[PDB]
Write an enzyme that holds these catalytic residues in place. Structure first.
Site, PDB file in Angstrom:
ATOM      1  N   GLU A 212     -50.675 103.457  56.220  1.00  0.00           N
ATOM      2  CA  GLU A 212     -49.592 103.482  57.276  1.00  0.00           C
ATOM      3  C   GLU A 212     -49.512 104.702  58.122  1.00  0.00           C
ATOM      4  OE1 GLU A 212     -47.309 101.418  57.468  1.00  0.00           O
ATOM      5  OE2 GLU A 212     -47.866  99.906  55.908  1.00  0.00           O
TER       6      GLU A 212
ATOM      7  N   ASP B 235     -44.527  99.742  65.509  1.00  0.00           N
ATOM      8  CA  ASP B 235     -45.539  99.248  64.437  1.00  0.00           C
ATOM      9  C   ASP B 235     -46.438  98.106  65.131  1.00  0.00           C
ATOM     10  OD1 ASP B 235     -44.266  97.120  64.194  1.00  0.00           O
ATOM     11  OD2 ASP B 235     -43.939  97.221  61.976  1.00  0.00           O
TER      12      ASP B 235
END
Ligand SMILES: C=CCc1ccccc1O
Ligand SMILES: [Cl-]
Ligand SMILES: [Cl-]
Length: 162
Positions: free
Chosen positions: A11, A20
């Site tokens: 991540e 994202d």
């Protein structure tokens, strides 16, 4: 290796609001803020989560705080789904890390309709599950990641995370 390192790897860490791969406001260690496209909705959301006026930025500890709560939530999400529960409990520890990863990434929702793989994983048909898993939007949108998890499921080892 464990879940936190593993997730920390897939991540990353960012102390400033960011979009994202899907184009959504996130922060820290994969912490989804909002699906809305208004940065202000995002900010409000952060503030609410952290407990203070952040102005789009946070500290490391804050990041890790969210992260802890998130892994927590994932697992709990798993243990609370009647379809997931039984699969998860059939797996060994490495492979359980992979389940949490997916979940962390795609929600208890996303993961829940991977029915065929679910069933495959339960039967311990590794190679089969692994092929099945690749036939998916998840793999096609985030191939490098999807490949690490998938290998993880397939082999039962951390090799993909070297
Ligand atoms: C294909 C799903 C694998 C899986 C099994 C159990 C819990 C979560 C999870 O993602
Ligand atoms: Cl929170
Ligand atoms: Cl990727």
């Amino acid at each position: 290796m464990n879940i936190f390192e593993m997730l920390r790897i897939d991540e990353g860490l960012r102390l400033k609001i960011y979009k994202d791969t899907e184009g959504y406001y996130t922060i820290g260690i994969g912490h989804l803020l909002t699906k809305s496209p208004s940065l202000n909705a995002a900010k409000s959301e952060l503030d609410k989560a952290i407990g203070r006026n952040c102005n789009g930025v946070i500290t490391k500890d804050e990041a890790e705080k969210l992260f802890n709560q998130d892994v927590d939530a994932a697992v709990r999400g798993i243990l609370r789904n009647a379809k997931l529960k039984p699969v998860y409990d059939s797996l060994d520890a490495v492979r359980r890390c992979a389940a949490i990863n997916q979940v962390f990434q795609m929600g208890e929702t996303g993961v829940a309709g991977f029915t065929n793989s679910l069933r495959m994983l339960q039967q311990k048909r590794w190679d089969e599950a692994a092929v099945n898993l690749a036939k998916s939007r998840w793999y096609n949108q985030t191939p490098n990641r999807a490949k690490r998890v998938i290998t993880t499921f397939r082999t039962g080892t951390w090799d993909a995370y070297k």
